[PDB]
C-alpha cells in the first residue's frame, strides 16, 4: 500500500546534490521486486568515469547495523545479555560497571566520542588517521581520556566509541574477528557479493566510487579520500558494500530473516532523537512527511554519504550514496531520496 516511487523526484534530488558539490550521486530502490536505479555525475572526478549504482563504496556508520545484528544473534544464542554490564564481559574496560550492552548499542552510555578530537579539522584529521592502524583498546583509551558526558542510560548522545565496544564484545565472546562473524552470519547467508570488511586494507575491491572529502574552507579543492584503513572506526564504520547489497540486508532484517522476533523487537525499541527520528539498537527510524516510517541507517565516512532504509516489512528498500562528505547541503539533499522513494509524487 505504498505510493509508487517518484523517479522524476529522485532525479531532481541527485541533480541538486551535484549542484551542491557532490561529484556523483545515485540511488537504488527495490520496490517489492521492481527495481529503480538512477545515478548522475562521476565516480572519479579526475578521470571522468561515470558513477553507477553497481559501484562499491564505503558505507560508514551503516556498519553499526551489521555489528548490531551479530550481537543480537549472540543474544539469541545465549551468549550475551543486553542488560549485563559491558565490564562483566570485558573486565576493567569502562570506568562505570553500570554501563550496559543495551546502552552502548543505543548511544545511551555517556562515553565520549573520540572522533570529535580526531576530525575537528576535517582534512588534517583525515590525513592524520587515514594510514593508521588502531587496536580496539587504543580507541577506547582515547575516549576515556575524557569524562563521560552523561550518566548511564540518561540521554542519547551518538558516539562511535559505543560501536568500538561492540566490536570488542563480538571478538571476545566469539573468539573470532569481526570480519569472520560478519561473513559467516550476514554476508554469506544473504549472498552479499559486493560486501566486504577488509580492515586494515586500504583498497576497495572491484569497481568503486572514489570518495571526495570537502575541506572546511568554503570553495576549497576536494581531497580524494577513497583509500584509508578506516581503523579509527572498525565495527563502527569500515564495511564496504553496494546499493543492491544494503537493500538486500535491510530488507532481510526488517522481514525477520536475521534474528528471532524477540531480538528484532529489542532492536526497534526507539530512543527519541527528535520529533521525526529514533535510534534502536544499531538502527535508525525516520518518520517521513506522508506518515510512513522507515528503518535502517546513515553513514558519513570521509568522502561518502549513505542512506539505507527499508519499510517496516522489508518489501521496499532504498539505498542512496553521494561520493562526498563534510557538505551539509549535500547531506540534507540526499535525505530527500527517502521522500521520493517512499512517499512518491506530491
Ligand atoms: C558514521 O558514519 C559516523 N561517521 C563518522 O564517524 C565520520 C566523522 C567525520 C567527522 C567527525 C565525526 C565523524 C557517524 N555518522 C553519523 C551519521 O550518519 O549521520 C553521525 C550523526 C552525525 C551528526 N548528525 C546530526 O548532527 C543530525 C541532526 C538531525 N536533526 C535535525 C532535525 O537537525 C539530522 O540532521 O538528521 C553530525 O555530525 N552531522 C554533521 C552534519 C556531519 O555528519 N558532519 C560530518 C563531517 C559530515 O558532514 O561529513 C554521527 S558520526
UniProtKB/Swiss-Prot annotation:
Q: What does this protein do?
A: Catalyzes distinct carboxypeptidation and transpeptidation reactions during the last stages of wall peptidoglycan synthesis. Mistaking a beta-lactam antibiotic molecule for a normal substrate (i.e. a D-alanyl-D-alanine-terminated peptide), it becomes immobilized in the form of a long-lived, serine-ester-linked acyl enzyme and thus behave as penicillin-binding protein (PBP).
Instruction: Provide the alphabetized UniProt keywords.
Output: Carboxypeptidase, Cell shape, Cell wall biogenesis/degradation, Hydrolase, Peptidoglycan synthesis, Protease, Secreted, Signal
What Gene Ontology cellular-component terms does the record carry? extracellular region
Q: Which family does it belong to?
A: Belongs to the peptidase S12 family.
**Pathway(s) annotated for this protein in UniProt:** Cell wall biogenesis; peptidoglycan biosynthesis
The molecular function GO annotations come to: serine-type D-Ala-D-Ala carboxypeptidase activity
Subcellular localization:
Secreted
Reaction(s) the record says it catalyses:
Preferential cleavage: (Ac)2-L-Lys-D-Ala-|-D-Ala. Also transpeptidation of peptidyl-alanyl moieties that are N-acyl substituents of D-alanine
What broad class describes the main subcellular location of this protein?
secreted
Q: What does the entry list as the binding residues for substrate?
A: 119-122, 158-160, 284, 298-300, 325-326
Q: What is its EC number?
A: 3.4.16.4
Instruction: List GO BP terms, alphabetically.
Output: cell wall organization; peptidoglycan biosynthetic process; proteolysis; regulation of cell shape
Matching InterPro entries, A to Z? Bact_CellWall_Synth/Modif, Beta-lactam-related, Beta-lactam/transpept-like
**Where is the catalytic site?**
61
Q: What is this protein called?
A: D-alanyl-D-alanine carboxypeptidase
